[PDB]
Coordinates of C-alpha atoms and ligand atoms in Angstrom, one line a residue:
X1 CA -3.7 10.7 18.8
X2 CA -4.0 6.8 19.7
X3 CA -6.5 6.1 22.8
X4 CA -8.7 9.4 21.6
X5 CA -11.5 8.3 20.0
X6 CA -15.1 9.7 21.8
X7 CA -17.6 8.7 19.2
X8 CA -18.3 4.8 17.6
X9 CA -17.0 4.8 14.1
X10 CA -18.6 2.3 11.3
X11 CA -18.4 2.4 7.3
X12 CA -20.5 0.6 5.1
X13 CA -19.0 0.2 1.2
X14 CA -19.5 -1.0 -2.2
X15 CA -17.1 -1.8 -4.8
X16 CA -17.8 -2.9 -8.6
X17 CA -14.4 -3.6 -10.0
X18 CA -13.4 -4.5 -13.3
X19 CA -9.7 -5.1 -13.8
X20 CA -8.1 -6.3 -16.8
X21 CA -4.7 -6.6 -17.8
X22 CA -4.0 -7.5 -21.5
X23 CA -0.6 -9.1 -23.0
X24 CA 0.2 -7.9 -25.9
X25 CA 1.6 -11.3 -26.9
X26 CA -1.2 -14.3 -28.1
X27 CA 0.8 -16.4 -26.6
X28 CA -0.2 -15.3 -23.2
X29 CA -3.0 -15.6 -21.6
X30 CA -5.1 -12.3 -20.5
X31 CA -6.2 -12.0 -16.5
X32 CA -8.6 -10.2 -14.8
X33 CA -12.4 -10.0 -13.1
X34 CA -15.4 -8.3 -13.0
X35 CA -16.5 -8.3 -9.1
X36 CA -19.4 -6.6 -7.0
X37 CA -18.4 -6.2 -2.9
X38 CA -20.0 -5.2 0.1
X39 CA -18.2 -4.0 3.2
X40 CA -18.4 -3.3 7.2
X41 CA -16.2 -1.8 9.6
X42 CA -16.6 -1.1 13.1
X43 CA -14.6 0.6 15.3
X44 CA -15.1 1.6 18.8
X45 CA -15.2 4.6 20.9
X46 CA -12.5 4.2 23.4
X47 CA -14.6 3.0 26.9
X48 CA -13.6 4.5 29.7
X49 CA -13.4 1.3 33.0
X50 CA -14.0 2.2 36.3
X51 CA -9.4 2.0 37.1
X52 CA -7.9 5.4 36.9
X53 CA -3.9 5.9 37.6
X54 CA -2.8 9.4 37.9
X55 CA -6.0 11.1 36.9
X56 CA -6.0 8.9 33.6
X57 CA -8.6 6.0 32.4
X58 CA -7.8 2.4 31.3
X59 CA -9.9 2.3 28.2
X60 CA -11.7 -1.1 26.6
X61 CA -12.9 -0.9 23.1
X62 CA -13.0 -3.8 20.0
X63 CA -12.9 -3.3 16.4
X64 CA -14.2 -5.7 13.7
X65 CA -14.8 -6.5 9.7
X66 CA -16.2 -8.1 7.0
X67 CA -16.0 -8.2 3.5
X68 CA -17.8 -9.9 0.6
X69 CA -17.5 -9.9 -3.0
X70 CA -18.9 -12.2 -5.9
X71 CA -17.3 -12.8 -9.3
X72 CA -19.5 -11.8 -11.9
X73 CA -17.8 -12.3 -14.7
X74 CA -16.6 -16.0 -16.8
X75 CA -14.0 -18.0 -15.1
X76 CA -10.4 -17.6 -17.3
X77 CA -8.9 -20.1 -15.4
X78 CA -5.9 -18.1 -14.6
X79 CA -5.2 -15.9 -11.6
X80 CA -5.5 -12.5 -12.0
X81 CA -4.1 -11.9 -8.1
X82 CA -7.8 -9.9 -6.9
X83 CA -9.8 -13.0 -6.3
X84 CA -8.3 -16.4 -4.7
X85 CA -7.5 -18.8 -7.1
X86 CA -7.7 -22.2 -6.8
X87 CA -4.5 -23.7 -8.3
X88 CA -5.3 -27.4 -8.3
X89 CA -8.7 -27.1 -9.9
X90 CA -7.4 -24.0 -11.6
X91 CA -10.6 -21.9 -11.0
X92 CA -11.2 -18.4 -10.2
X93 CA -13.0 -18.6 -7.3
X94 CA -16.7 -17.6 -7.4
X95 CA -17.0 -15.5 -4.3
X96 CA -14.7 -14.5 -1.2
X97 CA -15.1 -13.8 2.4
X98 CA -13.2 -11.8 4.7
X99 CA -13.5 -11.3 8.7
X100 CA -11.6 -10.3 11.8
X101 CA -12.0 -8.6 15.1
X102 CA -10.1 -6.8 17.5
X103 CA -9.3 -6.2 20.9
X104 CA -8.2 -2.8 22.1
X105 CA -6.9 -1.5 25.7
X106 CA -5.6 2.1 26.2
X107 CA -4.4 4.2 28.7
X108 CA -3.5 8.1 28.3
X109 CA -1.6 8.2 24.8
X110 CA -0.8 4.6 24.3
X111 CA -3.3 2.1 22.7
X112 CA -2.7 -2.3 23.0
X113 CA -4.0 -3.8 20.6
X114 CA -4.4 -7.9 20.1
X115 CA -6.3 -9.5 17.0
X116 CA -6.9 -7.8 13.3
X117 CA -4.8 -5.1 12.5
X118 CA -5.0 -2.9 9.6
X119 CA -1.4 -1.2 9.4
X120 CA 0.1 1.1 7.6
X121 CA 3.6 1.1 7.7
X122 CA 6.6 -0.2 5.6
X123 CA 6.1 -3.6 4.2
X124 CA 2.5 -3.8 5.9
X125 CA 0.8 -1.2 4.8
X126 CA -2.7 -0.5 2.8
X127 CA -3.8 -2.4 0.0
X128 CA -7.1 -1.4 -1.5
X129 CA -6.0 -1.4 -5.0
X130 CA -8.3 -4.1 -6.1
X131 CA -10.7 -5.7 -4.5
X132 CA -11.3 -6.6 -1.3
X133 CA -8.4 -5.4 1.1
X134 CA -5.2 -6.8 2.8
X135 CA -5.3 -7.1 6.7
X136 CA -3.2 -8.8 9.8
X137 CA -3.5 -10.8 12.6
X138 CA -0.7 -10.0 15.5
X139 CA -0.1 -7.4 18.7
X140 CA 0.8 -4.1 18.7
X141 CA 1.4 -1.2 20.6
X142 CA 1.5 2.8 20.0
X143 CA 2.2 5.6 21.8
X144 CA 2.6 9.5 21.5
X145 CA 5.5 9.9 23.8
X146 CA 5.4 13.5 23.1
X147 CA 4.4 16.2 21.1
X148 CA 7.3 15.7 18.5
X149 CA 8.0 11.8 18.8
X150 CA 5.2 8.8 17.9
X151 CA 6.4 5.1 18.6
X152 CA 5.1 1.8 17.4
X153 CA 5.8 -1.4 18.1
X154 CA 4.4 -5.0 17.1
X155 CA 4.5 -8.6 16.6
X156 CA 2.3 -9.6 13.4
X157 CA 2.0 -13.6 13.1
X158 CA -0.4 -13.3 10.3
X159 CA -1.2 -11.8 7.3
X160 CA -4.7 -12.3 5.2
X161 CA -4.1 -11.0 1.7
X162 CA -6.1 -8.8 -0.6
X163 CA -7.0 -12.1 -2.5
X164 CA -7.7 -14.2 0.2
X165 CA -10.1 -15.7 2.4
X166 CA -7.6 -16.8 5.5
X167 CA -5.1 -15.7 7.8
X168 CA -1.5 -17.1 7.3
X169 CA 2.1 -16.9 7.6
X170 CA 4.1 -14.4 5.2
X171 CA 6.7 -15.7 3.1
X172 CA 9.1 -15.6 0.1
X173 CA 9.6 -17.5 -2.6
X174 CA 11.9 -18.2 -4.9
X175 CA 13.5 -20.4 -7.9
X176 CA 9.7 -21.8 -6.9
X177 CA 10.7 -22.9 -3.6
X178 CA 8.5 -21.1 -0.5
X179 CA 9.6 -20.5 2.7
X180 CA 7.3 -19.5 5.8
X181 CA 8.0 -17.4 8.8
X182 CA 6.7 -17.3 12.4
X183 CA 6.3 -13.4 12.3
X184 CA 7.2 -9.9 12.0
X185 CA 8.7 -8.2 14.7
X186 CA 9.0 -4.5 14.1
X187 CA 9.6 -0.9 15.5
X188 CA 8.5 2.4 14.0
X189 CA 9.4 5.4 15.4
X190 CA 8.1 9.5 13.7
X191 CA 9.9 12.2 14.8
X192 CA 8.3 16.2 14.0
X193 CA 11.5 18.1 13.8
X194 CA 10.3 21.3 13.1
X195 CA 6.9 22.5 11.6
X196 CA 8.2 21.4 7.8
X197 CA 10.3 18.8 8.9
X198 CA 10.0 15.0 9.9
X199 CA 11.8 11.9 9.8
X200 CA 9.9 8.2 10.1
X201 CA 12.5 5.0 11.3
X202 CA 11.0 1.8 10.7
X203 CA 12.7 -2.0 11.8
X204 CA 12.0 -5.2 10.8
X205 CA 12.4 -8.4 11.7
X206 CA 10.5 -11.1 9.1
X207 CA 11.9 -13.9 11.2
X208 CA 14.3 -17.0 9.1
X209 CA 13.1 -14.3 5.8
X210 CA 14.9 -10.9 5.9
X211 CA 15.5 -7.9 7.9
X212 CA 14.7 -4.4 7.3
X213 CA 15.6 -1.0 7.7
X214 CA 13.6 2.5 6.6
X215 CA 15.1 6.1 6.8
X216 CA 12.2 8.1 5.7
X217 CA 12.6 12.2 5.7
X218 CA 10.2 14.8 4.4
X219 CA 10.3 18.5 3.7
X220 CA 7.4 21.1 2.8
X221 CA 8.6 24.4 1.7
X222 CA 5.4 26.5 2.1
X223 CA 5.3 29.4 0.1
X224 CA 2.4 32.4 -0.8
X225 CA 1.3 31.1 -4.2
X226 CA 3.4 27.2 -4.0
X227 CA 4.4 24.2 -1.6
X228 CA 7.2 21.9 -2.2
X229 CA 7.5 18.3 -1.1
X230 CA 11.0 16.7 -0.5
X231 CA 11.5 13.6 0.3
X232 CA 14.3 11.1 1.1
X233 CA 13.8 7.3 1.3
X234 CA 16.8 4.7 2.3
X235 CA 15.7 1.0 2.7
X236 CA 18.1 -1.7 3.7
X237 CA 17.3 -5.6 3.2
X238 CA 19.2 -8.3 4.2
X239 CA 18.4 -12.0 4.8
X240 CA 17.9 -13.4 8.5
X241 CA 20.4 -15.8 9.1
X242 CA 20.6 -17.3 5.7
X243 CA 18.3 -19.5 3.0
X244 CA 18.3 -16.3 0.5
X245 CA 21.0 -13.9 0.1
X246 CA 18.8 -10.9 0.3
X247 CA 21.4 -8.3 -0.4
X248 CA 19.4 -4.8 -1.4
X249 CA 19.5 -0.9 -0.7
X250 CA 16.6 1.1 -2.4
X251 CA 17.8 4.5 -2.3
X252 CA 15.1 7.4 -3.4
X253 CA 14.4 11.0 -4.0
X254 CA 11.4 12.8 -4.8
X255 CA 10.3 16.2 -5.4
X256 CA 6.8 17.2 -5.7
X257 CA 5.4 20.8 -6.3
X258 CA 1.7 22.2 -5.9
X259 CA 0.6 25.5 -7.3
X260 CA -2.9 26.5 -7.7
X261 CA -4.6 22.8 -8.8
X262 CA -1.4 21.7 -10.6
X263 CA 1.3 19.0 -9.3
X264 CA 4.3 18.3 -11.0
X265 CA 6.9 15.5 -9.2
X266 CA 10.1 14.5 -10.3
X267 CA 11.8 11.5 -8.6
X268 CA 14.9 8.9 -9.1
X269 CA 15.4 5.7 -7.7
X270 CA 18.0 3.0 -7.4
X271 CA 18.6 -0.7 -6.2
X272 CA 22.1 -1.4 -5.3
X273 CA 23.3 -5.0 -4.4
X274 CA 23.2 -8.4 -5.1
X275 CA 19.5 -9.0 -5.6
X276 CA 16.9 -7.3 -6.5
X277 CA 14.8 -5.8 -3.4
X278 CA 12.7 -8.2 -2.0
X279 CA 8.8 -8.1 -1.2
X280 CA 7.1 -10.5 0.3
X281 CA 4.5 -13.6 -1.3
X282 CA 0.6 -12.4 -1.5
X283 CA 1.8 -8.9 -3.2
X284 CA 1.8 -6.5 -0.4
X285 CA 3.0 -3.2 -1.8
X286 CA 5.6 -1.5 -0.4
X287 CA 3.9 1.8 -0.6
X288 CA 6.5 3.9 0.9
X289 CA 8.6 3.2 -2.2
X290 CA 8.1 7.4 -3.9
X291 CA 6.3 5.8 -6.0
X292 CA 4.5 2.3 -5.6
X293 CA 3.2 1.2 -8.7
X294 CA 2.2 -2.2 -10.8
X295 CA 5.7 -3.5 -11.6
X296 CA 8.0 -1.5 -9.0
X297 CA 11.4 -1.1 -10.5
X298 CA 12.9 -2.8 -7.8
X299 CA 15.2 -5.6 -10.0
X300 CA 18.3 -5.8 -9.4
X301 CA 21.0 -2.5 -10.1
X302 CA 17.9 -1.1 -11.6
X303 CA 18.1 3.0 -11.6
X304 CA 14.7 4.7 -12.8
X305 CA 13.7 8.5 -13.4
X306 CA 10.2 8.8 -12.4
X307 CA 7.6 12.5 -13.2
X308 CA 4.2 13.1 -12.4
X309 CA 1.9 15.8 -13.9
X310 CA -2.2 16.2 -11.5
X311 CA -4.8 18.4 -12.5
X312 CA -7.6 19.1 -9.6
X313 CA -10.1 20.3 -12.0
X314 CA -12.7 22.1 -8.6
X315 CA -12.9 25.2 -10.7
X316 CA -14.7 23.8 -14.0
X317 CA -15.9 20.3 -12.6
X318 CA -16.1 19.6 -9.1
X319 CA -15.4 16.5 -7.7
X320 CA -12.9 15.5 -11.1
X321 CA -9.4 15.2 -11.0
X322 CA -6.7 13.5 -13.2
X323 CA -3.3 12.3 -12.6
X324 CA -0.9 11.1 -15.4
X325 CA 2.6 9.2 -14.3
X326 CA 5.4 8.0 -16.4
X327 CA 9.0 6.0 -15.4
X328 CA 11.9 4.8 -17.3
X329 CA 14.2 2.4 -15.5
X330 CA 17.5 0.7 -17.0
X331 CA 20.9 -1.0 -15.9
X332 CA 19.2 -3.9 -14.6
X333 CA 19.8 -7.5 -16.7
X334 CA 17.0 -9.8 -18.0
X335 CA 17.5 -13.6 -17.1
X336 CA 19.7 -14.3 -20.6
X337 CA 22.1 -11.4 -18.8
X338 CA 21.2 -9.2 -22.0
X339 CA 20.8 -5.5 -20.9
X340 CA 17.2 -4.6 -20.4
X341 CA 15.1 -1.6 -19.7
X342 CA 11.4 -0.7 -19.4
X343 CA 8.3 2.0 -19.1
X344 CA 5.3 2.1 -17.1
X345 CA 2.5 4.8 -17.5
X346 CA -0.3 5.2 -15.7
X347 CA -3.3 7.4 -16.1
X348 CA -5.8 7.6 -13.0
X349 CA -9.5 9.8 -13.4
X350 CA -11.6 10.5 -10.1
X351 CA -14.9 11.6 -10.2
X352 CA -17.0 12.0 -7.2
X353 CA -20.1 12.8 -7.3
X354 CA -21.7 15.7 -6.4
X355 CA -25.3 15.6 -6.3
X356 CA -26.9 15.0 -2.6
X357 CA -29.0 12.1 -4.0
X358 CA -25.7 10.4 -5.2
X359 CA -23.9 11.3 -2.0
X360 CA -20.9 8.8 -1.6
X361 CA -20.5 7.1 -4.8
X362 CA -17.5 8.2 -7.5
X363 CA -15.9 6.3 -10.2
X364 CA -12.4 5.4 -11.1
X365 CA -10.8 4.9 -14.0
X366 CA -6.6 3.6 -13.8
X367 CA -5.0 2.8 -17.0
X368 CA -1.7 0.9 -17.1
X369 CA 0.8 0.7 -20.2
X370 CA 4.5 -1.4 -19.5
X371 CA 6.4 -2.0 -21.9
X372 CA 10.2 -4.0 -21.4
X373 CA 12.6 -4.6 -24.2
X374 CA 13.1 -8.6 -22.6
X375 CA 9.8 -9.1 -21.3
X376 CA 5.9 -9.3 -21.3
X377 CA 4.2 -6.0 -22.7
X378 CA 1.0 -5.6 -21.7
X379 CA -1.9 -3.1 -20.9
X380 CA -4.4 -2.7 -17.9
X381 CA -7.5 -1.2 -17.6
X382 CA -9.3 -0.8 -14.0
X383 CA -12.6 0.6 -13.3
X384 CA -14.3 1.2 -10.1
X385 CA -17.6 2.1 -8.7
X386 CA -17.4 2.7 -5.3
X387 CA -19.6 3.6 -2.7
X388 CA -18.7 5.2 1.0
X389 CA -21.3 5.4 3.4
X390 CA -19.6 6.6 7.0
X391 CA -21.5 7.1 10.2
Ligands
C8E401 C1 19.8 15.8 -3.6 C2 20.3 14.5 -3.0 C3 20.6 14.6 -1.5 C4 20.7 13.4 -0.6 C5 21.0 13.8 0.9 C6 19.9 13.3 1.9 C7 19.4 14.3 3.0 C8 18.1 15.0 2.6 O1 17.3 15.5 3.7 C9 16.3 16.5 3.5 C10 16.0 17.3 4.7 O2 15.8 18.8 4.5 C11 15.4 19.6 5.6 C12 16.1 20.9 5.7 O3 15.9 21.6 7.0 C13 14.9 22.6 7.0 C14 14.3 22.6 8.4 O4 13.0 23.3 8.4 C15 12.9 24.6 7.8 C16 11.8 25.5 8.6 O5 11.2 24.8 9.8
C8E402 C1 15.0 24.4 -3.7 O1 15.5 23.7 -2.5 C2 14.6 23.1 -1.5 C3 15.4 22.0 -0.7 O2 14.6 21.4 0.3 C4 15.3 20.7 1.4 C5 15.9 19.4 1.0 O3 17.3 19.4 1.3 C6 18.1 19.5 0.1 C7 19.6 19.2 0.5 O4 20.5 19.8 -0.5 C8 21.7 19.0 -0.8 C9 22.9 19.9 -1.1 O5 23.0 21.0 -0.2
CA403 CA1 -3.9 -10.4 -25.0
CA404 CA1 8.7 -7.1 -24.8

C-alpha cells in the first residue's frame, strides 16, 4: 500500500551497455554505444509528524536520484536514441547526467507527491531498456480506497527521457513539425474483482496533443500442475481539440500459459482508424501494449499475431533463463500505398549470478531481427552487465 513504508530504501547500480543495431542496407548508417553507469536512489521511510486526525499520522518523507554514464566507445555521429545527441554538432554526447528529488506527504492510505516521479502507468511508464532511465516532473496522488479498488490521479508537466539530461515538455511530431504541450492530466483507477480477476481504467489528457483511454482486464486460471493468463487491452486515441487527427483504437488479446518452467503466449493485435496509434516524442514505450517491443506494430490498420516460447532453466542452471518471441503483422500500407508487412524476433538470455562473492551482478543478452517487405531490415544486438546493490 501507498503511505506504508517503515524502513529507508536506497539502491546503488551499475550498467555496462553495449547496444547495436545494424542495417542490413550499406546505405545506412549503423547506431549504437558502448556505455558504463553508475546509479543512486533514495527513498524514504514514511515520517510520522507530531498531527494525528482520527487516530492516523500526517506523514513527511522525500525521495531523490542520480544517474551517470560515460560513452566509451568512438563517436558515429548518429543518434542511436540511449545517449543525447547533439544534432547541430552532430555528436554523440560523451557523458550524461541525470537528477531529481521528491517531496512526499501521506496520510492513512493516500500518498501526495510533488517533484520527480517515476510512474508506471499507460503512456508513462518504465523505461530501463537502455541506458540510463526515463523519469517525470509533476503532482500526483494515490490512494487505496479499499481493499478491492486503488485510485491515481496526477498532473505531470515534465518528462526527462531515457536519453536525456533535462526535464521538458512532451510532444508529437510529425511531417517534421513538433508540437509541445503544458502537461498530462490523468486518472487511473484498479479494481480486484475477484481473487483471479481485475480490471485497470486509465485517462488521459496530453493537453493541445491527444487524449486517451485504457480498458485493461486480466484473468489467471490457477490450476494443480498450470496457470493461465488472459488478458484484454482496448486503447482509444484521439486528438485534443485539433492540429493532428489522431484517430486510433488498439485492440488486444493475449494468452499466456505456465507449466512447470515453461511459458508459451499467444496474442493478436489490431489498430483500427485513420492513423496509426500515436506515442509520444523521446520514445516512451507504451508498455501496456501485450507486447511492447522495438518497432510496435502500431501503423495504421496493422493486425499482427504475436507467440512466445520461456524456459526457466532453476533445475540444471540456476539463475539462467531464456525467452524467444516472434510477430507477424500485415494490412497496414507503406508510404508509396503498396501493401506491406513485417517480422520481429527477439531472443532475451538472463543470467544471474550465483556465487555469494558475485552477489548482484547478471548479464543480459537481447537479440533483435526485423525484417519489412518496404522498409529498413536490420539486426540488434544488446548486452548488459548490471549490477544491483539494495539496502
Ligand atoms: C476472445 C475474444 C473476446 C473479447 C471479449 C472481451 C472480454 C474479455 O474479458 C475477460 C474476463 O474474464 C473473466 C471471467 O470471470 C471469471 C471470474 O473469476 C473466476 C474465479 O474467481
Ligand atoms: C479456456 O478458457 C479460459 C477463459 O478465460 C477467461 C477469459 O474470458 C473468455 C471469454 O470467452 C469469450 C466467449 O464466451
Ligand atoms: Ca550495416
Ligand atoms: Ca526491406
Amino acid at each position: 500500500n501507498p503511505n506504508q513504508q517503515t524502513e529507508d530504501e536506497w539502491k546503488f547500480t551499475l550498467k555496462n551497455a553495449y547496444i547495436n543495431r545494424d542495417f542490413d542496407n550499406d546505405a545506412l548508417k549503423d547506431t549504437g554505444s558502448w556505455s558504463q553507469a553508475a546509479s543512486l536512489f533514495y527513498k524514504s521511510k514514511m515520517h510520522d509528524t507530531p498531527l494525528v486526525i482520527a487516530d492516523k499520522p500526517i506523514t513527511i518523507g522525500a525521495d531523490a536520484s542520480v544517474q551517470y554514464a560515460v560513452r566509451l566507445s568512438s563517436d558515429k555521429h548518429v543518434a542511436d536514441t540511449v545517449l543525447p545527441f547533439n544534432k547541430e554538432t552532430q555528436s554523440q554526447a560523451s557523458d550524461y547526467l541525470k537528477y531529481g528529488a521528491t517531496l512526499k506527504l501521506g496520510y492513512d492510505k493516500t500518498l501526495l507527491s510533488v517533484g520527480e516521479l517515476w510512474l508506471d502507468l499507460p503512456v508513462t511508464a518504465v523505461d530501463a531498456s537502455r541506458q540510463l532511465l526515463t523519469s517525470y516532473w509533476g503532482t500526483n496522488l494515490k490512494s487505496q480506497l479499499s481493499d478491492q479498488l486503488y485510485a491515481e490521479i496526477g498532473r505531470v508537466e515534465k518528462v526527462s527521457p531515457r536519453n536525456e539530461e533535462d526535464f521538458k515538455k512532451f510532444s508529437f511530431t510529425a511531417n517534421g513539425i513538433t508540437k509541445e504541450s503544458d502537461g498530462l492530466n490523468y486518472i487511473d483507477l484498479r479494481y480486484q474483482f475477484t481473487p483471479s480477476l481485475k480490471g485497470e481504467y486509465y485517462f488521459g489528457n496530453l493537453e493541445d496533443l491527444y487524449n486517451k483511454h485504457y480498458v485493461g482486464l486480466e484473468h489467471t486460471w490457477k490450476q494443480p500442475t498450470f496457470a493461465l493468463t488472459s488478458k484484454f487491452k482496448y486503447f482509444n486515441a484521439k486528438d485534443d481539440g485539433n492540429t493532428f487527427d489522431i484517430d486510433a483504437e488498439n485492440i488486444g488479446l493475449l494468452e499466456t500459459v505456465k507449466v512447470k518452467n515453461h511459458t508459451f503466449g499467444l496474442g493478436y493485435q489490431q489498430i483500427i482508424g485513420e492513423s496509426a496509434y500515436p506515442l509520444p516524442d523521446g520514445f516512451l514505450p507504451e508498455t501496456y501494449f501485450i507486447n511492447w517491443n522495438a518497432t510496435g506494430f502500431f501503423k495504421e490498420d496493422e493486425k499482427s499475431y504475436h507467440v512466445m516460447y520461456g524456459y526457466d532453466f532453476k533445475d540444471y542452471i540456476p539463475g539462467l533463463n531464456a525467452m524467444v518471441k516472434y510477430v507477424y503483422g500485415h494490412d497496414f500500407k507503406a508510404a508509396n500505398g503498396e501493401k506491406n508487412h513485417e517480422t520481429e524476433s527477439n531472443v532475451i538470455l538472463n543470467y544471474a549470478f550465483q556465487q555469494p562473492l558475485l552477489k548482484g551482478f547478471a548479464l543480459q543478452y537481447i537479440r533483435i531481427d526485423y525484417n519489412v517487405k518496404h522498409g529498413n531490415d536490420f539486426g540488434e544486438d544488446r548486452l548488459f552487465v548490471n549490477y544491483t546493490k539494495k539496502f
